[PDB]
Amino acid sequence: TWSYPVDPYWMVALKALLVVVGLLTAFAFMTLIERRLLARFQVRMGPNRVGPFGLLQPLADAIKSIFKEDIVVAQADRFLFVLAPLISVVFALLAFGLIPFGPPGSFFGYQPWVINLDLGILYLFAVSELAVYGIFLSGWASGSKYSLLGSLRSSASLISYELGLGLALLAPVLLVGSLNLNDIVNWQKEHGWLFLYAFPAFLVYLIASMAEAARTPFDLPEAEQELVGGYHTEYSSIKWALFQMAEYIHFITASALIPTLFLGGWTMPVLEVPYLWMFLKIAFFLFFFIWIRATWFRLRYDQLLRFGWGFLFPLALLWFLVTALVVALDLPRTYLLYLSALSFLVLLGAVLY
Amino acid sequence: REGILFTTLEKLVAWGRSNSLWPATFGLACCAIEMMASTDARNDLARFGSEVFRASPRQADVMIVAGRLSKKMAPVMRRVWEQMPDPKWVISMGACASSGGMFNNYAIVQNVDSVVPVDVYVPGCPPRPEALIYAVMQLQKKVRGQAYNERGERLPPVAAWKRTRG
Amino acid sequence: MVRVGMRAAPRVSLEALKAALGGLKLSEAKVYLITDWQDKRDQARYALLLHTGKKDLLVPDAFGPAFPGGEEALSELVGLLLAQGARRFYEAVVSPGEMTALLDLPPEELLKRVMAIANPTDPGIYL
Amino acid sequence: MTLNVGPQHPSTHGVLRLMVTLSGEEVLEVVPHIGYLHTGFEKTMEHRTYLQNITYTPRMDYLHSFAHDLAYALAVEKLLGAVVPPRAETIRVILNELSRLASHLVFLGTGLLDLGALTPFFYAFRERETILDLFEWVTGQRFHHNYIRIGGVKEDLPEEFVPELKKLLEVLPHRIDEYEALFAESPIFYERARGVGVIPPEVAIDLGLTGGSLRASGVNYDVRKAYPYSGYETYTFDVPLGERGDVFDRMLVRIREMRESVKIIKQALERLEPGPVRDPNPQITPPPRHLLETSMEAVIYHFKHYTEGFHPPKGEVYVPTESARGELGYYIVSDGGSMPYRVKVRAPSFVNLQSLPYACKGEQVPDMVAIIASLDPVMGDVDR
Amino acid sequence: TLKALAQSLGITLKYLFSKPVTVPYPDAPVALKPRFHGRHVLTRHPNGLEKCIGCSLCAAACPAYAIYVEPAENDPENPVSAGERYAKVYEINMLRCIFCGLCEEACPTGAIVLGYDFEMADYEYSDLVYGKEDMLVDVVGTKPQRREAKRTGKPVKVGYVVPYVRPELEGFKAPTEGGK
Amino acid sequence: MRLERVLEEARAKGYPIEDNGLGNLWVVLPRERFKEEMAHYKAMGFNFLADIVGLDYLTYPDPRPERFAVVYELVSLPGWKDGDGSRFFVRVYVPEEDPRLPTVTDLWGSANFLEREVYDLFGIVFEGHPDLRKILTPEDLEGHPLRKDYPLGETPTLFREGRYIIPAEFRAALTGKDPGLTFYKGGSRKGYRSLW
Ligand code: SF4
Ligand code: SF4
Ligand code: SF4
Structure with a gap:
């Protein structure tokens, strides 16, 4: 926050409450949109019922979710059973304020973001650990080892790819020289769309975030059709809804962070509109x-662990070392454009055999 | 609190539950495959609110018993039902489930209402997917308090609200 | 096999069974409620066969709302079965004409018939 | 971890109970426990007329039901000496191959969903819905159709069946080729299925794994060629095979089978000429319904046939057939009465299940579901 | 086979842009084939006389034993059937009925014939035992449909359309292909 | 070709050969010779063991040697190494009070579940079986269903006002031991067969 002002604390609180309730409405209507987009993918059609567009069916669903006999299973830890959903939800909610939705003041006077901490990616990494925390903790508290095992699968896979996230995020810091999202964004304003320089890191970040329940491990696991996943199978009325909510918010937070970090967080080359381009990339x-x-299919999380551990993370650290050599010798910044373009050409030509 | 004790609130929550009816299939026989057909891309029970399908029993209000219920499966289905959240309803799909059907013998339960409190019955062998949709609208308007029998009586929103579980 | 109680005497049958059961543990026993007309329980009558595995106990069709106090007698009966630790409750469907002669068949035949025709049932429907 | 994968949970299709003795991510041994669908056909059928039993045959294997219908019909025809018209035979082979395609569609959809992705289920089920529309056109029922008869078939085809069947026979080659394009060049399915599912032919034979997962391990044994029954002897026939039995080879063999079945349907439709539809022997076939208002013999035979039925000779009989799940057959003991003395069914889904602990031995835990889906079980057939 | 991921995505996109395929019941009437096995109907002759002569052949051919037929003697003054016998009581337990059509197949007078109605889901076991006067050709709808149309005052609309009704259903009125 | 040698071997040792003019063949071995004879059969190249089917002849109009009879089905796959295609049945009668029979599980692993099923449905105990556990009938089920002394267990069908149906008294079809509704059954209804 070198160049950016700070709104009053009451205004920060207001913006925080706004971002939280907006993530509520966002995940609900994005569940609608995913239902209907899957329906379009498989030639069927979505819920033209309770809507018109189905957009009252999340209301009916929430109204069912409450009154649904929130049950505390016996032989489960009374306190931890209740406690784990709150953890998984809070630490998924937060860490979205950092994302700049515009130049300073473009929130109709004050601040596109909530907080613009000087060290951003470390905040993201830390809060990413806490999702896996909640996952395996609820797995334990469920008091069913069937669910616990899935929670452990989850934790193993997510932890692997969450470690990979760090070596992925290393590279752009060398170029920008700041850990502030707005500084990185402005660097992408000047030189342009950091992913053009760091395409391998972009790819490994994408595939790592896929392991964060996005999909294709798909041995996340969900309880369906496998040794059941963790964090669910014992919650009924509100806590299960909270688990799914947090998983989706993490999904969309990653879907927003990918353009925010690697691509052009809003800051378009043309027309520079504050919010719309960020939302469109999301x-x-x-x-x-x-x-x-x-x-795409499952991975059995054994192939997923093998792949993430042997391929993604070594590739990410290799690219980090190359970029570190380049920045230390500082020779051009054009060499990184050339190198990323050639790496993309290589990783593409190997497909069409 | 069960969705009761305010004129507007209870109709609103019944509306919500009726449209948010969460099916949990208990597939036993070919009735189960004819129910899987009620989800394909010709006639989908994925519009009224039954898009999602959580295999867990802790997560659904509607229990759809689709197929012949063998006496060896009765306690399993019994406990799957007991292990459901409380605002829960029971649909009995097909002849084998509703009555003993054409299999009138030692092996098959002659009425699933023996083991679980059944809300809706739907005859047929198999009952057509559109007959199953008629049954779910029937249950919808039942939990709306819009359901009456041939004797003139209004039917309670939730069966299994009337039993001394134990 | 023992036969206690008499038809259409709900409270006499209930008290006779109360006396005859004693401290018998019903953890592995099977309770067969013999009735007709699966659907309509409001005018249904009930007999009981208790298969302990070492000996059986028969009570004629004297329970259920079909008789005055027979509904409450059946509720108390099933409640006492559950209290004694009975878990396996079954409902047998016989014809009205059968129900009378079925209790006059020899023990092995009657018990084999009941075990063949019995449906697993939620005892709660009798509470 | 002696883990109890319960009946119907978690998402083990074909309700089954499994005691997976397993430490880690492998599969040491699965102890199967079945019987949750046992209905008692072998006993209930002893108390039904031979005509009545045609309502009981589709309901065990409810996916490929017309194979049950055909096996039972043929066994009774052999036992009482009946003559099947050629056009009725052609219709029977068409219906059998059509229900085969429907069953193959449902099997592959269920497997891909069981492990893999959800999307490819819907295309297979759209083609299955076209097939079910054909079945409604002809029999008035989706499945469990009461169409086959001891003499032949119940009645003749409507005008609209052949055009819609040609429509589907024209769209199907492209469709099956699409499924193959998606699957055979398997991106992840390869690294998921190629290794898993160990099927040595010797153990398949010792445990009797006949049901269509045997040729994926390189054994060329198909009943439609070894023991031709319904005139398949007169068809140009390719029998797909596999190199080493895995999930990959199983699935690809079944896809080639679907294309070959489509070619058989085209051939049979080409060789089709009008004629009669069932054995006119009144002891076997009810009198024509039009003269029920004219002949005393017609009325008597109608009445007697539809109440008591007919009495086959005293004897035991059996006929084998090839369904989409392997060798099927009925061992029928008839005592000269109007109801069969006993009917035992050889259940291919039942004999195939003896090779499950071996097949999934040492395989992965997520793959324990895929290896079950790939074996194509039907618990209506297993428990029976 | 890295190409397969891309090809799969591509074909899924093609089918995404392929919008149409579905039918929205009850908003769109389901297309049924003419031979469909639906609600039983008892048919009448052109004279208006019922065809059913109460011959219990439909019950004898019943594998589920779902047909109860109590017969009686036709009254010459006001006849019901064509012979000396008609159907005094004709009950079919739809919950026991397995929908063969063997009852029609044994029907010598063409009285009992399977119909086209499928919207017969109901709440009570004892309400699903259909009687004669619930199956006559004159009736339009199923039991819950009619009960809803009476407690609603809104006429019955069937959720099906067919190209035509079979001749055995003579008298059975249905929506046909757009003839209306 | 292997079937001809089976017939020749069975006839020389006094083993009855039952044949219908429809194409089905049985070889009935005594209880003693059953195990060793079928071991020899597997040795002859009978790869596949199709079925183990138990039969209760209690209610059969003509009498039989023993109440129960177990029938095995042996096959040799035609498309395997040297496939003839010879398939045939082996019938073995079992006394009512001696429900014993050696397993062939050691020979074919196919017999495992089939023999467990036969034990479930009939009281037939298979000697040497790895695990003889009730497969199909409920864990708490008492007896063996498919032997004729075991009731089918029907439930009456229900209608509006006291009107019910008992299938066992409603059935118009006759069994072989059922006399019929007239003074007797002759002709077709004592057995009928057309001459192709
Ligand atoms: S009612 Fe018919 S379709 Fe349903 S389980 Fe029974 S046999 Fe199958
Ligand atoms: S269609 Fe129904 S009433 Fe008719 S014979 Fe079949 S089960 Fe019986
Ligand atoms: S078979 Fe036909 S004429 Fe005879 S009783 Fe039945 S419906 Fe009436």
């Missing part, structure tokens, strides 16, 4: 991700 990644959800 929607783009959301649609591509739903395409993946529909269109």
